[PDB]
Amino acid sequence: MASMERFLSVYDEVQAFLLDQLQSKYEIDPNRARYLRIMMDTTCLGGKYFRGMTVVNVAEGFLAVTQHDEATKERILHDACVGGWMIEFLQAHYLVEDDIMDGSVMRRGKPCWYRFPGVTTQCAINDGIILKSWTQIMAWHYFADRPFLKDLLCLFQKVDYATAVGQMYDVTSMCDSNKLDPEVAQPMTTDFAEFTPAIYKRIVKYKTTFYTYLLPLVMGLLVSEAAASVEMNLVERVAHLIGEYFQVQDDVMDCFTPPEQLGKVGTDIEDAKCSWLAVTFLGKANAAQVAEFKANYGEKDPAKVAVVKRLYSKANLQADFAAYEAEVVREVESLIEQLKVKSPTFAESVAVVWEKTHKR
């Protein structure tokens, strides 16, 4: 059995479990069950499953070097799939809510969930709530007797909290911190003093890296009962690095990828987002380039968005990117090396994560 085909089979099994429990215990009717089914499929399916498959891949890694009965291999893979799905659905929660928060139009070349005609924001906000509740329903049902249950549940919450904290950092990133105040409508930054590497890094680490890289790697370790075969500080550091690289690619794509090939129309310029382009561009601009940037950033007006793009194009940020790229290729390989001291297997699983991030 190919890993993907296992993963996907477990989706069906998990879906059937959740909906049948809704009928037997939560008094649901068939039409509401269908609604929730369509919501689950529309919001959890259709991506690459990079996060969920990472849990499966790390588990498979350890299977190849650890003695187990066949039924134990099966059990561990079924746990890897279930934990995988917890993370996918946790992402779906965040994608649903974030698309509402930001007033987004599309993702994966289809409309945001809230924009479906029969959904609306009133239902979608609560649909996103349910998606994350399902992660806990999954975990208590399938992992009830597992020795890893508490470590797994405790890890998952802290990543979830961290992500919501990252979300806060992100949607506040175009404000001046010293002006934050619930009483007072928040003006956009005029000095851009807080568009720095360290501030950028903080947004990305909390908003993305913990849920996309750390969570899947460490869940792989928990369901395999293999946490003591890695140095957890290394796992965190390599996760940070790959996570940050991932986002920098995703920031360069918002600006320069055709909207058709991005699965969405990019708005980072017009949302005044603390992207890697703006931070890096402000790291090398002259006075006059900075003044022009400020007059044109965070304006929905397309003439001005052409101006920020022209400034970025003229700025030669590709050279800054290859240099960042090179250093990250450097640093990840050092971390992989350090990871081979304890688990060669694990370090290989990190290498595979790194390749799939480094290409796309």
Ligand X SMILES: CCOC(=O)[C@@H]1CN2C(=O)CCN2C12CCCC2
Alpha-carbon torsion angle 71, 73, 79, 82, nearest 10: -100
Q: Would the annotation count 41 as a binding residue? A: no
CB of 185 to its own copies, least distance (A): 4
CA distance linking residue 185 with residue 187, whole number of Å: 6
In terms of C-beta distances under 8 Å and separation of at least 24 residues, what long-range contacts does 106-110 make, across chains too? 106/263, 106/264, 106/265, 107/263, 107/264, 108/46, 108/47, 108/263, 109/260, 109/263, 109/264, 110/42, 110/46
Q: Residue 4: CB partners within 8 Å, gap ≥ 6?
A: 49, 53
Helix (H, G, I), strand (E, B) or coil at 17: helix
Identified binder of its own copies from the candidate list 60, 79, 88, 97, rule CB under 8 A: 97
Q: How many residues does the chain have?
A: 360
Q: Would the annotation count 271 as a binding residue? A: no
CA distance linking residue 137 with residue 182, whole number of Å: 35
323 residue type, one letter? A
CB of 303 to its own copies, least distance (A): 25
Q: Would the annotation count 151 as a binding residue? A: no
* 210 binding partner (options ligand X, its own copies, Zn ion, none; Cβ < 5 to 8 Å by kind): ligand X
Report which secondary-structure segment, H or E, holds 198: helix 197-204
CA distances (Å), origin 188, targets 21, 99, 165, 194, 271 = 47, 21, 20, 12, 10
Site string for Zn ion, 252-281 (x = CB under 5 A): --x---------------------------
CB of 98 to Zn ion, least distance (A): 4
Q: Would the annotation count 236 as a binding residue? A: yes
Q: Would the annotation count 13 as a binding residue? A: no
CB of 228 to Zn ion, least distance (A): 37
Q: Per CB under 8 A, which of residues 175..204 are in contact with its own copies?
A: 177-186, 202
Identified binder of Zn ion from the candidate list 151, 231, 236, 250, rule CB under 5 A: 250
| Interface residues toward ligand X, by CB under 6 A | 25-26, 158-159, 162, 210, 218, 232, 236
* 159 binding partner (options ligand X, Zn ion, its own copies, none; Cβ < 5 to 8 Å by kind): ligand X
Tokens 């399938």 -> residue: 142
Q: Which is nearer to Zn ion, 6 or 264 (CB)?
A: 264
- Strands, DSSP E only, in the chain? 106-107, 110-111
Q: Judged by CB under 8 A, does residue 106 bind its own copies?
A: no
Tokens of 138: 């999954």
Q: Which is nearer to Zn ion, 98 or 236 (CB)?
A: 98
Q: Residue 36: CB partners within 8 Å, gap ≥ 6?
A: 19, 22, 28, 130
* 218 binding partner (options its own copies, Zn ion, ligand X, none; Cβ < 5 to 8 Å by kind): ligand X
Report the residue number whose CB is nearest to ligand X: 158
Q: Which is nearer to ligand X, 218 or 234 (CB)?
A: 218
Residues that bind Zn ion (CB under 5 A): 98, 102, 250, 254
Binding site listing for Mg(2+): 98, 102, 170, 250, 254
Where on the chain is the footprint of its own copies (CB under 8 A)? 22, 26-29, 31-32, 34-36, 38-39, 42, 97, 100-102, 116-123, 125-127, 129-130, 133-134, 136-137, 140, 149-150, 153-154, 157-158, 160-162, 164-165, 167-169, 171-172, 177-186, 202, 206
Return binding residues for Zn(2+). Answer: 98, 102, 170, 236, 250, 254, 268
